[PDB]
Write an enzyme that holds these catalytic residues in place. Structure first.
Site, PDB file in Angstrom:
ATOM      1  N   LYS A 142      18.713  16.226  18.698  1.00 19.94           N
ATOM      2  CA  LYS A 142      18.649  15.541  19.974  1.00 19.94           C
ATOM      3  C   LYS A 142      18.146  14.112  19.825  1.00 19.94           C
ATOM      4  O   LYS A 142      17.150  13.855  19.145  1.00 19.94           O
ATOM      5  CB  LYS A 142      17.760  16.324  20.955  1.00 19.94           C
TER       6      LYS A 142
ATOM      7  N   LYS B 276       9.299  12.205  17.207  1.00 21.66           N
ATOM      8  CA  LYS B 276       9.155  12.265  18.669  1.00 21.66           C
ATOM      9  C   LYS B 276       9.164  13.708  19.175  1.00 21.66           C
ATOM     10  O   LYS B 276       8.257  14.127  19.906  1.00 21.66           O
ATOM     11  CB  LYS B 276      10.222  11.409  19.370  1.00 21.66           C
TER      12      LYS B 276
ATOM     13  N   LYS C 275      20.507  10.773  16.650  1.00 17.45           N
ATOM     14  CA  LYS C 275      20.742   9.502  17.346  1.00 17.45           C
ATOM     15  C   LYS C 275      22.146   8.982  17.090  1.00 17.45           C
ATOM     16  O   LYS C 275      22.796   9.376  16.130  1.00 17.45           O
ATOM     17  CB  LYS C 275      19.689   8.426  17.026  1.00 17.45           C
TER      18      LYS C 275
ATOM     19  N   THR D  84       7.602   9.750  31.948  1.00 20.20           N
ATOM     20  CA  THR D  84       6.756   9.155  30.921  1.00 20.20           C
ATOM     21  C   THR D  84       5.422   8.727  31.526  1.00 20.20           C
ATOM     22  O   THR D  84       4.365   9.011  30.966  1.00 20.20           O
ATOM     23  CB  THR D  84       7.443   7.959  30.235  1.00 20.20           C
TER      24      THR D  84
ATOM     25  N   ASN E 206       8.555  -0.090  34.343  1.00 24.50           N
ATOM     26  CA  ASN E 206       8.743   1.282  34.783  1.00 24.50           C
ATOM     27  C   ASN E 206       7.552   2.137  34.344  1.00 24.50           C
ATOM     28  O   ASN E 206       6.909   2.781  35.163  1.00 24.50           O
ATOM     29  CB  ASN E 206      10.063   1.862  34.278  1.00 24.50           C
TER      30      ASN E 206
ATOM     31  N   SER F 213      13.528  15.471  29.460  1.00 26.90           N
ATOM     32  CA  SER F 213      14.899  15.522  28.940  1.00 26.90           C
ATOM     33  C   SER F 213      15.194  16.934  28.402  1.00 26.90           C
ATOM     34  O   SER F 213      16.278  17.468  28.588  1.00 26.90           O
ATOM     35  CB  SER F 213      15.044  14.490  27.825  1.00 26.90           C
TER      36      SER F 213
END
Lengths: 395, 397, 397, 395, 397
Positions: free
Chosen positions: E66, E90, E102, E187, E218, E331
């Protein structure tokens, strides 16, 4: 029980070949056997579950191939043994297959024909994931025919995402993607094998007369092609009921054309067709021939073979001599793959070419390892199966 | 003797008291599918030995097939056939959306090197993969197999499966690799729950009657644990050494589980719960007993002769298949978590585990109350009854 | 007359008041895919009759397709096309991750033997399986089909699906075979929830205003049940016999559901909830009415002429498509449970069912408040609006 | 509407064959028809959705096969009817297929060529799961060509896991796995059919002169191969605008070589090419020939046929006579399957062999059931389709 | 300089302090699989330009792969290789059942028309689909990609996938198309949770010490939000304009998030949380600082020189990879919801999000306590440690 016999052929063969011990170990037993319980909703509205099997003996050389039996005697050991025999039958010809076989312990006589279909469909529905025109290719055996194959194919296609891989089953009717030359294939095979044997043993076909024991499917078509190939048959031999173990003989050869004609209406060197274990130690000692061509599986007993060798009589073994049938079965599969169908003449032309190729091989081996044709053919099959297993990395 | 007959007889007897259709027995008589394969291993000395292996799908009537893989030298086709039939029961007893399956390899894994052992395991998958999958047939550990073999199974399977990580195709995996919490002490947790609900239903209060546990193996360890966790406590244990046979500690007030387990580290050494071995509670041990309730945690401890006197002596009995089914209950949860790939906590696993054990208990009792018979003959009936419905709906008869 | 036009007109009208792009109508105008098959049946007398069958995937914009199968003699391609369009609405109304689908077989199942009926059902699957699946198109029961046909559907489908038990490929299954709890009384539970929230939003307290239910069929039975379950109660019923036409019981204080249902066994016999038949509440029945609120439980009871006066007479109306959608809501849950293979309890199903009905209600209201129009024209707009977004995101226009 | 006509051919055929009632019931209608809505993002940035169909009529004998139509007249009934006609077209030759057909209700004239591609790709994207070189094999029809086929193949492959099953569509360019002998196949077919008919009706090819009506693709290549086969054409016939319904005639045969040459530059017994329903009851009564060889579909009306029989004039029916095209289409598929490509000479050699096989069959049937060639060819197709359905267990 | 070395060095250093086997580094050294494709686009003017694209599966040891897709002109094979390695970290940091993946396309999407952009996106899928899937490799948004590109990805993928809507093959989808609630502010929610637990573990009470946030992007917007949501509050912000550089508002008592955000609409303009850019907190900024705790919300703000003084100055530090991982956590949830096709509410998403962040924190701390080292060097160790186990179990060494 029936497994030891075939294991024996391997280990004797491997023993005279001098191949690696792995060869026997790997060939000792089937790569895969599936046993299933096939429920049938019977006509009276009932359920009876029948046991069924498919045994893939080998895929070393190619996909697996062999027939399906509807006998009450079939059990796991039968199918295991029989599929091992198939691996021989195949490699003998040098076909890109390995041995496979299946069966259902049933007495199809006890079954209605919708019941019989339901069983046949139910057999496929039990195993389809390990069948396919490039995995394992079933064909007819005892109590099965092109009608069962056609049921097998119908259900198979449905399961197969509708892809008509019709070469997943051979022995189909010409009407449904089978092949010409089928019915008289083995007889055509034998006749070819007879001529080349004779030729190699210094006998001219038109020049020495011949005896054929039995007049079944084989027999009928072996005398036919003997005529077709310039030879001719003086002594036949056959059985009735009503006499039993009798023999025809109309002198300078029996006219096949007209004799066959009389089976319709009336229903009534050495080629044994018909049955097994004819030609035992004390039967072999009684005849007079320079050559024996086995058309039936079985004829000569291990005892019989012994005297033949000392009496100076040569012998072409069933497995080779009667392999035209499976040769043609293979052609059917080829035609299914690219979907172009051959003519009877085209089938015979190839059939003669390939039989002669296989004969040449068995002889070359016998000449090299200095032994009988019977022990040579089995060696021929193991030898090429061996190469493939080693290349593929199986040992 | 052929292990199938015993398994089959349980079907024959259950169907007989249920009054279900004769097809039910005929269909359940034998596995839907058994594959026997020849698994070649290139041995470390550079040699080939071929080992026989099996997977037997007994039933998929109710759901996909599920059951463990055995690496014993005693395993043969009849073993696996019988065992997988037992699995169909094990499952239906809980009312899980599975059917019975099982597999094995006739090997002495002791004789094997660990790269040899891997090649065998991978070779087993490579032999059958087309009839395995998280929605066909799901293998798990049995004798001589663990999460290590499962992890090898999963690796090879994924490779063969077009690289799709259907990891719920094998359960009994390590937490570290998509296994589930609550595993190791599942069965023990299970039996404790069942112990309490049985007692409750037979008019016994947990904190209010003391208990005997035969055996302090994995099962026993975690059954006394959860008895404490659930307000009860164990006075009499029982265990074996070498060095003295069957002994039984009794610290009256009960003896802490906490301190006891702590002494098995370093030292290496009312009613009743047999763990450990089978065929304890014979005919003449079931005369000498003084309890109102027996809770089978081990498979076995029922000489069918023993069962007979218990009924007349007035002693109730919760059968293994139900009482010790927490393990497979948790194995099922693992599979669930694999399907949507979300993983539950030990607390979440126990919460569900209690809920579902209680559901299954309630079912077995309801049946016993209705068909007016033993819990042991009720549980088997519970399994057949629901397998029956499915076969009928699906059109199998 | 062609059933499509009515379905299409609902799209045309909704898109018109939404102001969405002309492609929206063009894309939604007709099914993405319709398969018509010839299903041969070997009849019991040994004969062949070939029955026509259809599946119509209307939309997969938002998710896989879903809708029932009909065994009526009236079913034809236009029926299924129209019906599946209606399904797209039914679904989006709730905001489910589906699109509309539907199927049928032009048969009179009455004329069929039950092995004949099975062979037909299996033959239907065998005709279309490649465009069915738990993530392509999911069939369910409709007229003349039930969990028995679904169970036959599932059996044949699995066989065709490489033996993978994707049982969520068909919903409306028996609990005994991977169906879901809460099914049978889903819609009734649904309407009751909606009844309360509507009232609440229109300034009516549940326990504080009495209610009329036309019809006591399956729907009506379980709508009065849950009205009681939710603190309210029903004074006036209404029902039909043979043997006397439209009658209406009125036991003032309300009449127990509990005792009433009990009398349908043995005897076989403020505001308003029509169940039973359509085209009740005509233009001249909607003049004679005395209620502040109508809650459609049956599909139908709206002569578009009737709707007109209700608006002027000041009477609010919750439309069938929303009010009676609990059934499909629960059908969806079944599919969810099938996906990860964990099964919910009747209480767990209701808890979610309430949550989600309330979510959908809130949506339809929000739209009505924004585009300043009727609930009936709001619900259709709600469905199109979200289908629209998906088509745009996916790049369909 | 158009369906009754073809249903009629079946039930008349079945009626004179005496086959089981199931045969008609099963053949009455397509086994599967898919109707899809193909959205096209048009060049101005708009969406128009076009309806499309594929109808698999039969797979009894083999996978389904037939063309795709881009006409504005195409609807479900067209495609249903047309695919039924295909099952005849195929079985007539005795090919291992069944009938299939598709279409899109479009006026491709209204479309840009990126629009046209998007539609073609969108058609495949709508049905691919029920297409494949062993399920159903689409080919060109009206308004489609090798360019559309090439678009079909590109998108299909992408959908198909990248497996280049290029024989899933025939009528491809040679440049992209099509086959030699394509363009002039039908004309070659007709010429072969003419010679064998004549021969069987006691007419020697070089020895009787011939009339061909129309000079399109067929016609052009039928006069060509008549010359190629020792015969020659005296009377042609053709249409203009600018006269219309005219006729050439340069005496002891028109030189094809040089006449063809004049179509470039200038654009300007009995074989009707060109159009339908020429030869009606009162047109048939006016000519003078012992034999009619239909090259166009249609020519003789049911009324015309009647007088021909009484006037003593024999007639080889379109479906047989003009089937070389599909014969070659079949060869293309064969070549795709094993990926070996034949030469023009190799294609003709086989093409002659197989046409003659099919002719022989239709004649054998006519001789047996004692009726017209037209009613014999349809019977030939049904007869073999019947066998397969019965073997497969469909009744 | 080659971005891989930095990623690889993190592995080399972690494995070194863990003491794991040398194979661990060798296996993790590089991606398991990288595909490079040539994507032709028929440009609007009728032309062909071919763009290079990549997907790099770094690891599937622990689960499917992922990570996001980049449309930058700087992307090349080394970028993606490095980036996907970072993803493995991650993921493992959270202990998710994934591995790193990726992808990217060397394009300037600015230069592209939006039908051109779609054709590129579809063309990317068409190039790799056989090595993508909800159980092989799951792409998500990265730089220059969003839910619009994902939606195009999903559409083409489904077409290629036999029409099976495995929509969890791409995450970062719109809610309107099977995305998940809680996404946009994930996040920010994440970092706030971690801020509180860090403080708590370092003896700081949330409501009791005021806080500085560098950046109000953000991330920053939603980190001050949830600090308020969790009982704390922010005194000092910090931000950038054009029109004046680094400034920092300080309304002492804290300044409402509510009113502040409201002014960014219309106007367009103890311890510490850096958001915004990397390489803030250099060696000489980490001398001037007065805080007991740093919580990295941006990736970056660590000159490895800076880290050095913080340790000696006595200042603790929660590393980006952990602190800002809520986004990918959410996610993951999206993917879960896609698998069984049931969708969670914003409240349900937060509830789980808190639970799981706390689980991951507890892990990183436990490791730091055991191997007696920094949180930054602990988190990387946490990831490798669990990836290690899986590789070993699976038989990779």
């Amino acid at each position: 029980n029936p497994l030891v016999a075939a294991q024996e052929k391997v280990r004797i063969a491997c023993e005279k070949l001098g191949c690696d011990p792995a060869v026997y170990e790997l060939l000792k037993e089937p790569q895969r056997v599936i046993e299933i319980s096939i429920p049938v909703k019977m006509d009276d509205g009932t359920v009876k579950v029948f046991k069924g099997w498919r045994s893939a003996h080998s895929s070393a050389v190619g996909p697996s191939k062999g027939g399906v039996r509807f006998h009450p005697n079939v059990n796991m050991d039968e199918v295991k043994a029989l599929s091992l025999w198939m691996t021989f039958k195949g490699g003998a010809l040098g076909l890109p297959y390995g041995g496979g076989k299946g069966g259902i312990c049933v007495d199809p006589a006890e079954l209605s024909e919708r019941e019989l279909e339901q069983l046949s469909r139910g057999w496929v529905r039990g195993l389809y994931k390990y069948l396919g025109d490039r995995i394992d290719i079933p064909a007819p055996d005892v109590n099965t025919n092109g009608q069962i194959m056609s049921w097998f194919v119908d259900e198979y296609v449905k399961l197969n995402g509708e892809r008509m891989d019709i070469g997943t089953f051979t022995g189909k009717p010409v009407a449904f993607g089978g092949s010409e030359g089928r019915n008289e294939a083995t007889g055509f095979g034998v006749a070819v094998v007879v001529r080349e044997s004779a030729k190699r043993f210094g006998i001219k076909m038109e020049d020495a007369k011949i005896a054929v024991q039995g007049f079944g499917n084989v027999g009928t078509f072996t005398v036919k092609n003997i005529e077709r190939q310039g030879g001719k048959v003086c002594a036949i031999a056959e059985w009735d009921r009503n006499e039993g173990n009798y023999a025809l003989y109309n002198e300078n050869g029996i006219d096949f054309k007209e004799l066959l004609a009389y089976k319709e209406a009336n229903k009534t060197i050495i080629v044994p067709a018909a049955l097994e274990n004819v030609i035992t130690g004390e039967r072999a000692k009684t005849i007079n021939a320079k050559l024996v061509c086995e058309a039936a599986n079985g004829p000569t007993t291990p005892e019989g073979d012994k005297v033949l060798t000392e009496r100076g009589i040569n012998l072409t073994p069933d497995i080779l001599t009667n392999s035209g049938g499976v040769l043609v079965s293979y052609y059917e599969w080829v035609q299914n793959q690219y979907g172009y169908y051959w003519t009877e003449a085209e089938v015979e032309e190839k059939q003669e070419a390939d039989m002669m190729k296989a004969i040449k091989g068995v002889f070359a081996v016998a000449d090299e390892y200095n032994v009988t044709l019977r022990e040579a053919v089995y060696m021929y099959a193991i030898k090429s199966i061996d190469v493939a297993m080693k290349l593929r990395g199986w040992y």
